[PDB]
Design a binder for this molecule. Structure first.
Ligand SMILES: CCCCCCCCCCCCCCCCCC(=O)OC[C@H](COP(=O)([O-])OCC(O)COP(=O)([O-])OC[C@@H](COC(=O)CCCCCCCCCCCCCCCCC)OC(=O)CCCCCCCCCCCCCCCCC)OC(=O)CCCCCCCCCCCCCCCCC
Ligand SMILES: CCCCCCCCCCCCCCCCC[C@@H](O)O[C@H](CO[C@H](O)CCCCCCCCCCCCCCC)COP(=O)(O)OCC[N+](C)(C)C
Ligand SMILES: CCCCCCCCCCCC(=O)SCCNC(=O)CCNC(=O)[C@H](O)C(C)(C)COP(=O)(O)O
Lengths: 88, 98, 459, 128, 178, 110, 67, 124, 80
């Protein structure tokens, strides 16, 4: 039929997959709850690039006012789940 | 930057409620409780309409003048007419620029 | 033709002798029966009219109007019983009495053989309409509307009366048959010019003519739904019928006395069609639509050709049915949300699909889609105007575009888009409203099937 | 440096090209604060009735009522006959009528003059 | 769309927004991935060259030239995600979104099917009804005396409370309702 | 024209449906091997639209062009017809090159 | 026929679609070659276009500039 | 095309005008000319109902082609000789038209040059 | 159904135009931290693709073989 019913585990896997292809983060040091400025030492431009990469990966745009607030991969996964009506 | 604690907590609570609501939209196995030959297409959709149309054109439409007008058939040299039996002469001894 | 007049006068005491909870049923049933009876007047001749007696006659122009009136009475009855549920029994009987008296006056008006009798009945129609508007209207503007409805009419009709009696002191008769047979040309003098104006201005203000139309938006907006129905579908056609009747004695003055009115009609048709494009009130949009269509009818009557008369008759019938349907469709939403603003309740196709289908059919008929009788009348009038002068095809063509725009505009504003979030009192459509829509729309296409019944005597 | 974009009525100036938002001062920030406060107060007043479980019907909006009243019923009481109003009314209400009268009268006079001389080719012109 | 806006945007916020817009439009110009990566790295270097300017006036003046350059060199037909406010499917499914209160007008024959769903609906309605008085009182308590100054709403703090004004956010129709 | 225009639109619709309702050619990568039958149909339709000899578009467009070439007609109209029939092949090349050749550019969930 | 997503790999191809595509491309090219072999005149022209300047004055009937 | 460039950029006085052509008598340069004949009768072309534009001097070949087309209906690839004959006749017609065009151009240029030469001779 | 993502360390920019981009950015002191995210578009079965002329002449070989066979049969079938 159409695309399968995206789940929370799939979204988390895809976000972590995209983040682990970033050269500026260490894959071993990266976790689901790691902060971008605090734990990973990135600036705002890197966060914008990460948001753009997520947009490319999932194929939908995140508004700037909402994208400014996502600081950990768990927050990105949660925003995606609430946007796409995913509950399991 | 990021969220303040109040926004984070409100988003968590609204997310919990929304996932509960979306889980409630699901259908249990009994939800739609409903309360209590081969070539027939070619007959009811082609044969019957063509019968009606042929009858209507044969016995009603053509009962009046000029209702179904057909253009005159083309006649070529060397042809013979069906009614009169007249044959048409040939075509003026071609110069034969072979 | 007393076989139609007497049953209405019998509807009167039957309503006044009915049990308190059976008035609507009896009235609707017997009004439908009277419409079925009046259906027999469509059997007309090809040469002369149906001269029943010295007082009443039926013609190929008045029979469709009589059928439309007798058919409209039951529709008004169904459309009225919703918002009059809390009324007392006596006031409900009074409202039904006003409706019945209006129907009786219209029936006698459309068949009078005499011009003074026609004037008396065509003026008597004001009292029930005025009482209905000023008593059962909803807002405080209604009083003013009544005044605007009254004097605008009377200032046009009182001179006519004078002219009428003047004619009777010159020719000796105001009977329509004798007037037609003993017709004589009108000379070119100032007295004849003012006699022409006196004979024409009443029917031109009842059309209404552009510039003289200010009473119509008030009257059609502050009136109750039955009042709007009867004002738009029948009472506007009194002017057209009267002009078609009275023009037999105005030739050849019309040949040059029609220029100001033709100019007003065409330019004001464009103007009112444009006004419909910026209207925050949904009822006012329908009222101005009526103004534009009646301007077209005025042009058709004024150019005085057989094709124009045929198209004008068809256009009056089609406009009556269509405008009544549009008013009822708007009244459904008003009764749901208690507001007349068009952009208040939006996206109603999602909530009411069958109502959206009714809206689509009404709007498609309003913009004269072929082969509807609206289109037949409009096209006949346009062909007659083209014969009158080739340049008219500009203005007429302009109107044809603008109409469509505003028509679809209304639909796109009310049915499409997204529903308003805070409006949660939109209940499913009742069987009564769907039946009202169906009984409005089915006769339109049924007459499309046999169009010679509404083409008038010139057919 | 680069070619400049000049705004028009039907193609307005973008926000990022506006000099007014690139030189700010504290009273502008205060004004923005009061604007947001008014917007938030109206939003709260709306949302309190919007979510009320006992609310059935239409939430009345005085802004819509004011808009419709201004567009319909307030216009005449605030009308004054001025040279501008009088001239615009005379033009837009009289000029088109006389223009169309002149055009149609000229056309019909020419057609009638052609008819009188018997040269218009009215053959097959049965229906009128 | 979910977050309450502020009275104004900060300088850093404007710079970030211009950076994102420039990157997206440059990608619209550079169709292929490797070329886009090359020119995006060039743009990133161009952006971070003036990152350490202590003069705010000169920073906002540089931002002014940046906006002028972007407006001159923008893509006339930039790529838009299909469901974005300019995309080809922005409001495609809005005609299928039906409010929940419509279910309150279903005929009992229609409600005879799906009994358990309507039981859960009754439970939700009861929860909202119980919750409403508290939600109003909490909003009354937490509001400054001069009316609210932002559009943000407080969370629930009490033992079994619910966040005030939650019904129409929780019961959104769906993103693909039908 | 009905034939190849309808089937070109059907191929475009197939591409759109496969790539999650995406219509921009800039995000349509290399579908030559991923969509073999669609590629075949679109190539055949593009060659028919450009009047490649002995296909369906040849028997009408070729005669139309050779007939405007042999007529007492406006010179500007003839020149514009020739430039337009060049631009036809130009935009067909654009469609094929951007939609089927090269490397993928669509979201990774294939 | 069940085809599952791949996530950054080439899509799964069934043999049928490849056979159909190759067959139809081959039939198109065969038709073009066959028709050109039998209807070359439709592309290269059928009759030789004569040039005018090699037409003598005798058949064109123009006088030798004297009478 | 070159004739267009010759007429529009060069001397148009000596170039033929397609609208007004031919401008010399048909018997002017030729001592005698044969009257071009037709093979198809008017009634024959009327019975065939060709066209008002297909009733040219090659109408007989077209009539024969149509007759063979009708007779060989299911085999729509059998009337190739008849089509070839019709095409050859139309080709000869076009060749004749080109010959007329050149005859007119040569007559125009020769007449104008001879008139100029005679005027110069009478001017000395 | 029940499919997992491929392991992430197989994606490398080596042998792809992304390598050329990295070399050109290195000469300017710059770096591209996103190449491995784009490597999948060149890594797997998308490694090579035809040219425009190669795409237009898709089934030319089979059709030409069939045409040659048919014409040869025709040449020796008129010898009946
Ligand atoms: C040529 C066709 C022949 C058809 C043969 C059968 C015709 C049956 C006609 C029935 C009588 C008309 C009923 C109108 C009211 C609708 C009733 C209703 O609620 O149905 C719901 C019912 C159940 O659906 P649902 O699930 O409740 O859906 C509700 C939702 O809102 C969802 O609603 P929806 O989205 O389904 O909307 C309804 C649907 C359809 O609904 C409608 O629009 C009905 C009204 C159509 C427009 C009418 C105004 C234009 C003037 C036409 C005048 C023709 C009169 C002919 C005599 C009719 C006598 C009644 O909308 C449309 O399909 C588009 C409407 C616009 C059509 C434009 C056509 C242009 C003219 C075409 C030719 C007309 C002349 C023919 C002769 C020409 C020379 C040979 O569906 C149906 O029964 C079918 C719908 C009717 C479609 C008929 C459209 C074609 C017929 C044209 C007129 C009849 C001609 C017959 C003689 C042959 C000619
Ligand atoms: C808001 C909309 C309301 C509806 C509008 C109704 C329109 C009514 C207009 C009346 C149409 C024509 C009226 C008179 C016919 C001719 C008009 C005149 O201009 O023509 C010339 C008239 O000549 C001069 O114009 C003399 C008349 C001048 C005095 C009239 C006053 C006009 C002022 C306009 C005021 C606006 C009137 C509407 C008020 C509401 C013709 O020359 P003449 O041959 O000699 O007269 C013909 C009559 N004869 C044969 C007996 C001799
Ligand atoms: C496609 C065609 C259009 C091209 C348009 C693009 C061209 C313009 C590029 C040049 C414009 C500039 O750099 S304008 C340079 C503006 N100057 C400053 O910003 C100095 C103060 N620094 C800060 O504000 C933050 O450090 C900040 C930099 C935001 C980082 O934010 P974070 O670290 O907290 O994430």
């Amino acid at each position: 039929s159409d695309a399968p019913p995206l789940t929370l585990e799939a979204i988390k896997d895809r976000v972590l997959y995209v983040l682990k292809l970033y050269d500026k983060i260490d894959p071993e040091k990266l976790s689901v709850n790691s902060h971008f400025m605090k734990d990973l030492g990135l600036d705002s431009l890197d966060q914008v690039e990460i948001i753009m990469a997520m947009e490319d990966e999932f194929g939908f745009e995140i508004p700037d006012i909402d994208a400014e607030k996502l600081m950990c991969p768990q927050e990105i996964v949660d925003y995606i789940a609430d946007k796409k009506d995913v509950y399991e | 930057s990021g969220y303040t604690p109040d926004e984070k907590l409100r988003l968590q609570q609204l997310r919990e409620l929304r996932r509960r609501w979306l889980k409630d939209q699901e259908l249990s196995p009994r939800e739609p409780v409903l309360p209590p030959r081969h070539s027939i297409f070619a007959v009811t959709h082609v044969l019957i309409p063509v019968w009606i149309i042929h009858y209507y054109l044969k016995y009603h439409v053509t009962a009046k003048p000029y209702t179904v007008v057909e253009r005159k058939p083309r006649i070529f040299p060397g042809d013979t007419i069906l009614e009169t039996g007249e044959v048409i002469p040939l075509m003026k001894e071609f110069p034969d620029q072979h | 033709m007393l076989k139609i007049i007497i049953p209405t006068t019998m509807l009167l005491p039957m309503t006044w002798m009915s049990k308190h909870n059976m008035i609507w049923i009896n009235a609707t049933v017997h009004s439908l029966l009277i419409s079925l009876i009046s259906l027999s007047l469509l059997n007309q001749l090809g040469e002369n009219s149906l001269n029943f007696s010295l007082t009443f006659f039926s013609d190929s122009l008045s029979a469709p109007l009589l059928v439309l009136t007798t058919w409209l009475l039951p529709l008004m009855l169904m459309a009225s019983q919703s918002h009059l549920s809390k009324e007392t029994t006596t006031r409900k009987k009074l409202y039904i009495t006003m409706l019945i008296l209006l129907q009786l006056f219209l029936i006698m008006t459309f068949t009078a053989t005499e011009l003074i009798l026609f004037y008396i009945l065509f003026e008597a129609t004001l009292v029930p309409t005025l009482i209905i508007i000023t008593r059962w209207g909803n807002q405080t503007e209604r009083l003013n509307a009544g005044l605007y409805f009254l004097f605008y009419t009377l200032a046009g009709s009182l001179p006519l009366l004078v002219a009428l009696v003047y004619i009777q002191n010159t020719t000796g008769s105001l009977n329509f048959l004798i007037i037609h047979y003993w017709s004589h040309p009108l000379s070119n003098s100032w007295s004849n010019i003012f006699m022409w104006l006196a004979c024409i201005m009443a029917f031109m203000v009842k059309m209404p003519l552009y510039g003289l139309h200010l009473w119509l938006p008030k009257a059609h907006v502050e009136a109750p739904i039955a009042g709007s129905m009867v004002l738009a579908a029948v009472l506007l056609k009194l002017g057209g019928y009267g002009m078609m009747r009275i023009t037999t004695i105005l030739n050849p003055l019309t040949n040059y006395m029609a220029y100001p009115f033709l100019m007003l009609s065409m330019w004001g048709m464009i103007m009112t069609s444009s006004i419909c494009l910026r209207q925050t009130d949904l009822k006012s949009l329908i009222a101005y639509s009526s103004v534009s269509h009646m301007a077209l009818v005025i042009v058709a009557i004024m150019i005085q050709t057989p094709w124009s008369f045929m198209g004008a008759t068809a256009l009056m019938i089609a406009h009556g049915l269509t405008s009544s349907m549009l008013f009822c469709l708007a009244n459904t939403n008003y009764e749901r949300v208690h507001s007349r603003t068009m952009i208040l309740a939006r996206g109603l196709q999602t909530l009411l699909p069958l109502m959206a289908t009714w809206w689509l059919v009404a709007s498609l008929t309003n913009l004269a889609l072929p082969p509807s009788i609206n289109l037949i009348g409009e096209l006949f009038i346009i062909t007659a105007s083209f014969s009158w002068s080739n340049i008219t095809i500009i203005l007429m063509g302009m109107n044809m575009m603008i109409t469509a725009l505003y028509s679809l505009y209304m639909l796109i504003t009310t049915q499409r888009g997204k529903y308003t979030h805070h409006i949660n009192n939109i209940k499913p459509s009742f069987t009564r409203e769907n039946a009202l829509m169906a009984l409005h729309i089915l006769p339109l296409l049924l007459l499309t099937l046999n169009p010679k019944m509404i083409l008038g005597p010139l057919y | 440096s680069f070619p400049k974009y000049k705004p028009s009525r039907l193609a307005t100036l973008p926000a990022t090209l506006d000099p007014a938002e690139y030189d700010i001062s504290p009273e502008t920030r205060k004004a923005q604060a009061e604007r947001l406060a008014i917007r938030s107060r109206l939003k709260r007043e709306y949302l309190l009735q919007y979510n009320d479980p006992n609310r059935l019907g239409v939430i009345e909006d005085p802004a819509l009522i004011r808009w419709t009243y201004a567009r319909s019923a307030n216009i005449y009481p605030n009308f004054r006959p001025t040279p501008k109003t009088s001239l615009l009314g005379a033009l837009f209400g009289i000029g088109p009528l006389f223009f169309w009268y002149y055009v149609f009268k000229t056309d019909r006079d020419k057609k009638e003059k052609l008819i009188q001389e018997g040269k218009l080719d009215q053959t097959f012109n049965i229906s009128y | 769309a979910f977050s309450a806006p502020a009275a104004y945007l900060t300088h850093q916020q404007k710079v970030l927004r211009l950076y994102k817009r420039a990157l997206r439009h440059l990608e619209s110009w550079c169709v292929h991935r490797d070329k886009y990566r090359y020119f995006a790295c060039l743009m990133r270097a161009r952006f971070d060259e003036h990152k350490n300017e202590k003069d705010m006036v000169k920073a906002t003046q540089l931002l002014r030239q940046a906006e002028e350059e972007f407006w001159y060199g923008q893509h006339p037909q930039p790529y838009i995600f299909p469901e974005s406010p300019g995309g080809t499917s922005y409001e495609r499914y809005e005609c299928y979104k039906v409010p929940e209160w419509c279910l309150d007008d279903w005929h009992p024959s229609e409600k005879a099917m799906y009994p358990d769903y309507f039981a859960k609906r009754e439970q939700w309605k009861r929860l909202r009804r119980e919750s409403w008085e508290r939600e109003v009182k909490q909003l009354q308590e937490e509001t400054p005396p001069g009316g609210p100054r932002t559009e943000a709403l407080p969370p629930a703090r009490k033992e079994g409370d619910l966040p005030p004004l939650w019904w129409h956010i929780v019961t959104r129709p769906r993103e693909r309702p039908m | 024209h009905a034939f190849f225009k309808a089937m070109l639109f059907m191929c475009s619709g197939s591409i759109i449906h496969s790539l999650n309702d995406e219509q921009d050619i800039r995000k349509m990568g290399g579908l030559y091997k991923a969509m073999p039958f669609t590629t075949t149909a679109l190539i055949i339709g593009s060659l028919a639209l450009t009047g490649m000899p002995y296909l369906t578009g040849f028997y009408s467009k070729d005669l139309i062009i050779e007939a405007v070439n042999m007529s007492y007609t406006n010179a500007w109209a003839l020149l514009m017809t020739l430039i337009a029939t060049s631009l036809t092949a130009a935009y067909s090349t654009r469609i094929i090159f951007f939609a089927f050749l090269g490397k993928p550019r669509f979201p990774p969930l294939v | 026929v069940h085809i599952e997503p791949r996530y950054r790999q080439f899509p799964q191809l069934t043999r049928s679609q490849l056979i159909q595509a190759e067959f139809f491309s081959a039939t198109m090219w065969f038709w073009i070659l066959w028709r050109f072999w039998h209807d070359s005149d439709a592309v290269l022209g059928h009759f030789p276009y004569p040039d005018p300047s090699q037409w003598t004055d005798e058949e064109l009937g123009i006088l030798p500039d004297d009478e | 095309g070159a004739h267009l460039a010759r007429r529009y950029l060069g001397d148009a006085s000596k170039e033929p005008d397609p609208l007004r052509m031919p401008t010399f008598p048909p018997d002017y340069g030729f001592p005698e000319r044969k009257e071009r004949e037709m093979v198809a009768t008017q009634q024959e072309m009327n019975d065939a109902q060709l066209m008002l534009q297909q009733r040219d001097y090659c109408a007989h070949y077209l009539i024969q082609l149509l007759k063979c087309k009708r007779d060989s209906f299911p085999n729509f690839l059998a009337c190739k000789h008849e089509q070839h004959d019709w095409d050859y006749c139309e080709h000869l017609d076009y060749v004749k038209r080109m010959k007329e065009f050149e005859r007119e151009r040569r007559l125009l240029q020769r007449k104008k040059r001879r008139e100029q030469r005679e005027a110069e001779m009478a001017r000395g | 159904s029940k499919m997992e993502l491929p392991d992430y360390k197989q994606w490398k920019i080596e042998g792809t135009p992304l390598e050329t981009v990295q070399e050109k950015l290195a000469a300017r002191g710059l770096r591209d931290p996103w190449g491995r995210n784009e490597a999948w578009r060149y890594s797997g079965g998308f490694a090579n693709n035809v040219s425009f002329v190669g795409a237009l002449l898709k089934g030319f070989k089979w059709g030409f073989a069939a045409f040659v066979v048919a014409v040869g049969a025709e040449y020796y079938l008129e010898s009946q």
